[PDB]
């Protein structure tokens, strides 16, 4: 699968992928908001026919409490293209971009505490670590974990 930086004409296709794959959905205007604020940060995975099988929609946190850091708004890989490493590859690309373009020191995301699949993906394969819980984060009412992946070793391997 092709992995490449997402462009504005990709966002509707991303939105379609999102809607097929995940419960948290956004309106196109929010997608535009990302691509016209942090264009370097979102990546897609597409097939022979330019059909999106995965994406990572990413941003920098607008008012970081500490250091500047990137934030995963959404990440999906169609189960049909499970088990090809796209989630790691997508994530590694947005990570590298957050470093080059915004000097991010880490990447954060949010996960329902009961979403076993995602917890295992982010913790075990992408080296994300639990940092803090957001009580009643979801409209559902479930608490979220916030997870951070430290970006400073990647940054050091890049400067070399």
């Amino acid at each position: 699968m092709n992995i490449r930086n997402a462009r504005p004409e990709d966002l509707m296709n991303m939105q379609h992928c999102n809607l097929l794959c995940l419960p948290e959905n956004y309106q196109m205007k929010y997608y535009f908001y990302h691509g016209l604020s942090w264009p370097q940060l979102s990546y897609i995975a597409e097939d022979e026919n330019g059909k999106i099988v995965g994406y990572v929609l990413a941003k920098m946190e607008e008012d970081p409490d500490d250091v500047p850091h990137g934030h995963i708004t959404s990440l999906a890989v169609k189960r049909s293209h499970r088990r090809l490493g796209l989630a790691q590859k997508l994530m590694d690309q947005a990570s590298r971009a957050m470093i080059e373009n915004f000097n991010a020191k880490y990447v954060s995301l949010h996960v329902r505490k009961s979403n076993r699949a995602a917890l295992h993906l982010y913790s075990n394969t992408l080296n994300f670590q639990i940092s803090e819980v957001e009580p009643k984060y979801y409209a559902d009412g479930e608490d979220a974990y916030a997870m951070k992946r430290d970006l400073t070793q990647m940054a050091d391997e890049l400067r070399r």
Binding site: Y26, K29, F32, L36, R79
Partner: protein, 771 residues
């Protein structure tokens, strides 16, 4: 505030009304309005009345807003305030063109007004009044030369006009003032530079762009963009040595991006098929984890190097047990020969794996676990499905379901089989199964919902989607809240399949409402992107919006609507299905759906064949000729296009000339260039007798000419010998629908000798089964 000339107390009041409006102190502004208007000397005072109406509009009282702003305006039509408010008001109703007139009128009486110039320009770019946007942005720069936004907009003005060199000179000027300033954000400067570089490139000043990029490269932080356009430019300038270095760095950065492999082929220019494979070989040994370098040579290799690579590729993928192996290779299935190499090899893998758990008996490696065999059986299930052998494929999936009843992928492919075999009702039940195996996975849920939709179980699909829909409201309303066009398009087809034309049109129209909404979503980034200097993406979005309705979703919706509006013409805020099917002018509504296609989707033959059908019923013979020609340019032998010419050729010859003898003879000269209709049809069937989709279009057309040779029509249409190039499930459904159709006159006789002759050919297809 100068446009207003009132006594001090009211002049003070009036300034408070303006200030309340800015701070959204509407309830307080209203009180001040009433105070001015209660004094008889100023009960008619236009700007207070205009400001009254605009405040009211913010509280949703539109019609009193319009009475006030209009009445206020009329009292003082040389008040720039009154003109500005009327424009402001008409803007909140997205009536952008009319708002433009009011701003232009307001400046007739206040030439150098900063706010109206900004608002006016903001709408001119929104409407792509590019000439007027440049005037307005220029006027701004002379009044406010030290503000960055003044320059950004001027440059953008010329870029969008394609005056690339003037855009270049404005940008360099702005760049100089931004190198000096200490307020500069690295990221914002970097973006300015890549935009400056992009215009140089779009002007074909390739070397100037390269020298620019090298000068300022270390101040550009988006290093993806640096290296990608460096490679582009170096290839453009025949710096092929340096291009190869650039693309080698790029492929290290992302070994799974096709583009950098084609850059290398452009830089290195491999002479033969093996020199080209060397590029990918080296990528494997450098990036062993990567899958893209190990997949792409399958597209150009052939002979024994093809099977050696395929052997390495499938062994890897079957041992690692990844699902989408078949999906990655579907493009190779257009090559009839590669498919045999695949079939002989994977089939061999299965027969070998059961005798001895090794890919080939001569392999040395340790024995492969039982999972490896399941994955080849999972492949061959998909392989025999694509080949058109349903039963052969269906036995493989069933052996594998019995071995591992837990792997959800086998239930999807089993559903795909029954779909491809024309039994969607069966396919739907297998998705329901798969769906219940992981209640948590929406991707499975959607496919179930989709298959249930296609099976016309619309209410069952709603309840299935509801498992992931927001708990507040019903599922259809949330899907529309979230701009879910896959559900609404698939729903419109289902509603159209059940002759519920009203409800389908409701869905078709909700899809258009989405494209309206997305088209409007650009408005806020006009100003935002000037503070953010994300100009590349900004112009990308502007260019996106200009062709937005090119998207597949629009076409899918528009097709369904145009079909229904034609079927409703042949036999006759709130979108009500009942009212939408009632439309008095069905062909006119179809025209509105067709107009974006005629502008943005000239690619597709359908956009011209559909256009033909609207103008054929609408008598317009000039437009009828325009549509047939653009279709003929795309595919001269298209079976639908053939049916369309035979209908134009004869309604010219046969009746209702009702036009200048030139319009009546232009078609005679133009169609005899592109003799006689009946032999025109016979020659079509002559050149394309082997093809059936063509064969039927001839067949219906010969019945159009005469009912006498209906019997011969029936024989030419129902040919089913394997000689035919394109005798498949959906075409044969086209032929038998064509007998019930009436387009072949009352052929219930041959229809059931055809349904039963087709039941033997596609035993799973439902359209062909006995009553």
């Amino acid at each position: 505030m100068p446009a207003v000339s009132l006594p001090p107390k009211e002049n003070a009041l009036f300034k408070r009304i303006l200030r309340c409006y800015e701070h959204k102190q509407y309830r307080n502004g209203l009180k001040f309005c009433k105070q001015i208007l209660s004094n008889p000397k100023f009960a008619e005072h236009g700007e207070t009345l205009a400001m009254k109406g605009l405040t009211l509009n913010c509280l949703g009282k539109k019609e009193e807003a319009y009475e006030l702003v209009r009445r206020g305006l009329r009292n003082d039509l040389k008040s720039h305030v009154c003109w500005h408010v009327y424009g402001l008001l008409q803007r909140s109703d997205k009536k952008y063109d009319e708002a433009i007139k009011c701003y232009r009128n307001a400046l007739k009486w206040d030439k150098d007004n900063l706010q109206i110039l900004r608002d006016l320009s903001l709408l001119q770019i929104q409407m792509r009044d590019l000439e007027g946007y440049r005037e307005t942005r220029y006027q701004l720069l002379q009044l406010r030369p030290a503000q960055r936004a003044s320059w950004i907009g001027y440059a953008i003005a010329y870029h969008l006009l394609e005056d690339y060199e003037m855009a270049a000179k404005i940008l360099e000027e702005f760049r100089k003032t931004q190198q000096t300033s200490p307020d500069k954000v690295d990221y914002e400067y970097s973006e300015l530079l890549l935009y400056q570089n992009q215009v140089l490139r779009e002007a074909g000043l390739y070397r100037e762009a390269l020298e620019h990029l090298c000068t300022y490269e270390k101040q550009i932080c988006d290093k993806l963009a640096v290296e990608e356009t460096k490679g582009e430019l170096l290839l453009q300038l025949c710096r092929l040595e340096d291009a190869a270095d650039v693309y080698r760095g790029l492929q290290e950065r992302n070994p799974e991006n096709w583009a950098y492999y084609k850059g290398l082929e452009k830089a290195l220019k491999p002479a033969n098929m093996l020199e080209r494979l060397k590029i990918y070989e080296e990528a494997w040994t450098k990036y062993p984890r990567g899958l893209v370098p190990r997949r792409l040579p399958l597209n150009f290799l052939s002979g024994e190097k093809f099977k050696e690579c395929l052997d390495k590729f499938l062994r890897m993928n079957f041992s690692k047990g990844c699902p989408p192996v078949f999906n990655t290779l579907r493009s190779l299935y257009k090559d009839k020969e590669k498919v045999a190499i695949i079939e002989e090899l994977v089939v061999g893998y299965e027969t070998s794996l059961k005798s001895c758990r090794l890919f080939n008996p001569n392999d040395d490696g340790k024995e492969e676990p039982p999972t490896t065999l399941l994955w080849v059986q999972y492949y061959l299930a998909q392989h025999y499905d694509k080949i058109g052998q349903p039963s052969i494929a269906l036995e493989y999936i069933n052996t594998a379901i019995e071995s591992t009843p837990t792997l959800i992928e086998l239930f999807l492919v089993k559903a795909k089989i029954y779909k491809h075999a024309g039994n969607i009702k069966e396919a739907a039940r297998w998705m329901d199964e798969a769906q219940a195996l992981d209640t948590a996975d929406r991707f499975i849920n959607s496919k179930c919902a989709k298959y249930m939709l296609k099976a016309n179980l619309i209410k069952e699909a709603e309840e299935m989607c509801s498992k992931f829909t927001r708990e507040g409201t019903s599922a259809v309303e949330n899907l529309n809240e979230m701009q879910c066009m896959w559900f609404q398009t698939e729903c419109a087809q289902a509603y159209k399949a059940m002759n519920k034309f009203g409800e389908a049109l409701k869905k078709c129209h909700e899809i258009e409402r989405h494209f309206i909404e997305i088209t409007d979503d650009q408005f806020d980034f006009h100003t935002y992107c000037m503070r953010k200097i994300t100009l590349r993406s900004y112009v990308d979005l502007l260019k996106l919006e200009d062709v937005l309705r090119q998207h597949p979703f629009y076409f899918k919706a528009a097709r369904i609507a145009i079909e229904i509006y034609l079927k409703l013409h042949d036999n006759p805020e709130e979108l009500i299905p009942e009212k939408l099917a009632k439309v008095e002018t069905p062909l006119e509504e179809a025209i509105k759906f067709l107009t974006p296609l005629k502008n943005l989707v000239k690619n597709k033959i359908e956009t011209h064949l559909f256009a033909f059908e609207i103008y054929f019923r609408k008598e317009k013979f000039l437009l009828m000729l325009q549509s047939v020609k653009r279709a003929f340019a795309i595919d001269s032998s298209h079976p639908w296009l053939h049916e369309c010419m035979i209908r134009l050729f004869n309604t010219a010859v046969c009746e209702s000339k009702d036009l200048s003898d030139t319009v009546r003879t232009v078609l005679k000269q133009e169609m005899n260039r592109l003799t006689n209709p009946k032999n025109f049809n016979e020659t079509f069937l002559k050149r394309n007798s082997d093809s059936l989709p063509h064969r039927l279009s001839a067949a219906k057309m010969v019945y159009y000419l005469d009912p006498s040779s209906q019997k011969r029509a029936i024989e030419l249409a129902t040919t089913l010998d394997e000689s035919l190039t394109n005798r498949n499930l959906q075409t044969c459904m086209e032929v038998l629908e064509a007998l019930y159709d009436g387009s072949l006159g009352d052929c219930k006789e041959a229809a059931e000798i055809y349904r039963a002759n087709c039941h033997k050919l596609f035993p799973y297809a439902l359209a062909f089964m006995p009553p």
